[model samples]
Target chain A: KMQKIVNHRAFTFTVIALILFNALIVGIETYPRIYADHKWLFYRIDLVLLWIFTIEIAMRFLASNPKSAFFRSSWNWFDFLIVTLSLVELFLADVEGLSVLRILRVLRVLRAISVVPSLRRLVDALVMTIPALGNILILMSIFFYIFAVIGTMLFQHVSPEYFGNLQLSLLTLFQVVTLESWASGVMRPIFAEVPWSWLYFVSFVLIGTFIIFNLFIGVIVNNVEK
Target chain B: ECLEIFKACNPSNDQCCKSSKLVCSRKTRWCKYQI
Candidate 1:
């Protein structure tokens, strides 16, 4: 009898809709102390969604053609675990683990990845890219080390705040790589001291943006294709 | 596993940050590459 209703295509979409609404509630609950003033409303909404998810999980489990197949569905287990966590979080909040439990509630939105095939594939592809990603990371490290040494030697006296030592120069070089205030804020002051410094700054960006950054994109794209 | 940004790290041994992206900040006793 449960399968009669659970088999409907609409059932999946409705669960998806609930997951999205749960995500939105999690998001707004973080907004500047406002959610604190409105705890009664949000609290009730959380309780209602938790029960709905609990029922949805039960229905899906009961609908499985062979009850054992339900356990084989990794996605089904994910749904099962998250719902159980929420139920425990609900009953045990008064006894404590409240802060840790609150954080786990935010993870309920991760259920969307199980329900959405595209998201599931993308997350899988990203995981697959890890080994190749580490290779690029090694290459990037050599660049940072060499550039850090050069910057520390060249600008140590010119701007000790940035290039005081090898370690500091590496930290400053990270800011350079991010392109955050690298030009006007970081480089220009050094430029005023030594005009030739622009050559180093320009070359680093040219290599970082034109060469290394695109390598990262290429790897991710290739993995996505697979 | 490598320590995430601002995660507590041993002050004496810097090798905890095996990941090049993060570096141990001995001054803060935490790991972070940049602010």
Candidate 2:
């Protein structure tokens, strides 16, 4: 009887709606003018939202297997932890940045992932694909190490700033991999002295950014297909 | 949009139905009463 009422679809939607409303309030408070003008109003609304969440969780607990249902779902535990932490923050009001604990309040929005099926499957697929990603990461690291050593040897003399050592050269290579203005920022200057440096930069970008990243995407897509 | 759906939802109402590819569950999305 109690379960049927709280487990109703409309009630769940209402909970989800309130979570979004809370998120909206949090975002609005980030603006300096709005926060300054209506700080107390925001605080009042936030407190109300917190109680709503508390009631929602309580209702959910009642709707489930009474005693063990809360422990059965990871999302419930997440909500429980966040709500408990929020209680601590609310009670320990004198502590500065305690409100920052409410930053976690933002994660409540992710409850939609647990609520929606496709998103849950997508997250589950991503979780399952992690092992394959680790293998690809290992492959990528070796590729980067080889390129870093070669980059150090070739460009060390022309641009000590970029290739000062193995570590710095690795950093520069990472920047290039990210395509962070590699042509103008790192490559053009080196190409000024070493005309053949174009080949180095082009090959590194093609291999590191294009091929390696595509492998990651391919792995994810493949797993998602399964 | 689902956001709009959520906004339009009335807490006092009894049921909810949405046309979506998502598979909502009680443990996760908590929409067991969907029709």
Candidate 3:
């Protein structure tokens, strides 16, 4: 009955408790001041959660077969180390700060929780596209350098208010890359003089949106195929 | 070198912006338009 209890009930409860504990931590972090007047209340709740997780880790480690098997599995070692590190840092310290060991707690949560497919397709794609993404990165850097230099040179004097200087033009380029298109809103009157300058802007947007955007897609597709 | 040449020198801002504007404006209706 004791062995069966560990196998069925303890295992499942540990998992659910771990997940809920993490969600609670996220909730507290997101709204730290929700119970600010009752400061001791939050601390008490966190202590309870910490103790629950601490027990869960110990039980899971005990349930893991052969004892030596604990050292064999990388993920087991990661989980155990993270649990140990969090306990030591949180309980043993006054300030704690952002210790290297405490960071493992964050990483442990991310590794366990973030791999869920329901979270974000972009994260999954980026994780999967590591190889082909390297190529696209090189291409994108070249584009940025060329565009930054050209954008800095051509429009630097014409619209000193918007363009300002090389650094400002680069910032404007970044803003445009994020699809804000602030430069067009600011410099429409100035570009109205030549009218031809609009061709350059449109071409940049074409290259950025259509051609460059597809490179990102291409990376994901090729990486998945490989 | 491909770098040395300005390909398609006859390009007009008016032409580019006209199509570009249509593309930008039509983006909102694209799902509806496509279906």
Candidate 4:
């Protein structure tokens, strides 16, 4: 069956090797001197490699039982979408020695992940807990909005440079929660007028960051256990 | 004598780049760097 060879170890290695070579060509094409003088050659080589990739992808898809099996798997769907984008670039992008898909060319390298077992599992783990992460994101976002508004109200006049408006306060408070020299960079400067600003900064760090943020880490670690 | 950055040299003779860290590139007119 067509499926047997496509899933074989040798076929997988060959595809991986071709993917890496394609990446190398993409990298070398970045040099202006090399590309301008030799753009035609790189283009020809790219077309050949792309067709070969198309053939490989087609073979893999056909090998899947009745072709619907390939469509059912998310990774295979991702592979198909990448190849489809690449084909669209080939046909539509004729803009005078430029490609509309430089990023797509680089992402030929990204396909190496599915060919390798460990990398496949790693992405699988990361995507599995995306729903759980949404709740934590919403919780942290609420605190960020509340603290940003409160800070803007209290320090709008005292530290107009940092808390001049809601937008400015939001950015500054986000920076403050990261605990990057907040006492010196943000809090101490604001204390030039609002000396009681420690309560605002300290409480945001204690609750908004130190308490709520670590839940993000805990959720990821829990996902890895499964 | 270990400097080996694209110096001109004969390939077969290997005498131009007199260093252990380099080898003459074959008929290419340059020193090919190596371990």
Fraction of real interface contacts that model 4 preserves: 0.00
Taking the tens digit of each residue's C-alpha lDDT, what string does model 3 give over A112-161?
44334355456655566576567777877777678778876777777775
- True-contact fraction per candidate equals 0.00, 0.00, 0.00, 0.00
> What is the Cα root-mean-square deviation between model 3 and the actual structure?
24.3
Pairs that collide in candidate 2 are A114-B28, A114-B29, A115-B29, A117-B23
TM-scores of chain A across the candidates, in order, are: 0.62, 0.74, 0.60, 0.77
Better of 2 and 4 by lDDT: 4
DockQ (Cα-based) for each candidate:
0.02, 0.01, 0.01, 0.01
Best by lDDT: 1
Ranking by DockQ: 1, 2, 4, 3
TM-score of each: 0.56, 0.66, 0.54, 0.68
DockQ of 3: 0.01
Residue-wise lDDT of candidate 2 within B1-35, one digit each (tens)?
34312223344542335553222232112232222
Q: Residue A202 in candidate 3 has what lDDT? A: 64
Runs off by more than 4 Å, candidate 2: A1-5, A91-95, A98-102, A145-171, A193-200, A213-217, A220-226, B1-35
Residues A3-97 of candidate 1: C-alpha lDDT, one tens digit per residue: 45545567778988999999999899888697869877887888798889898887777777654765875777787888887675433223234
DockQ of 2: 0.01
The residue pairs in collision within model 1 are none
| Candidate 2's TM-score | 0.66
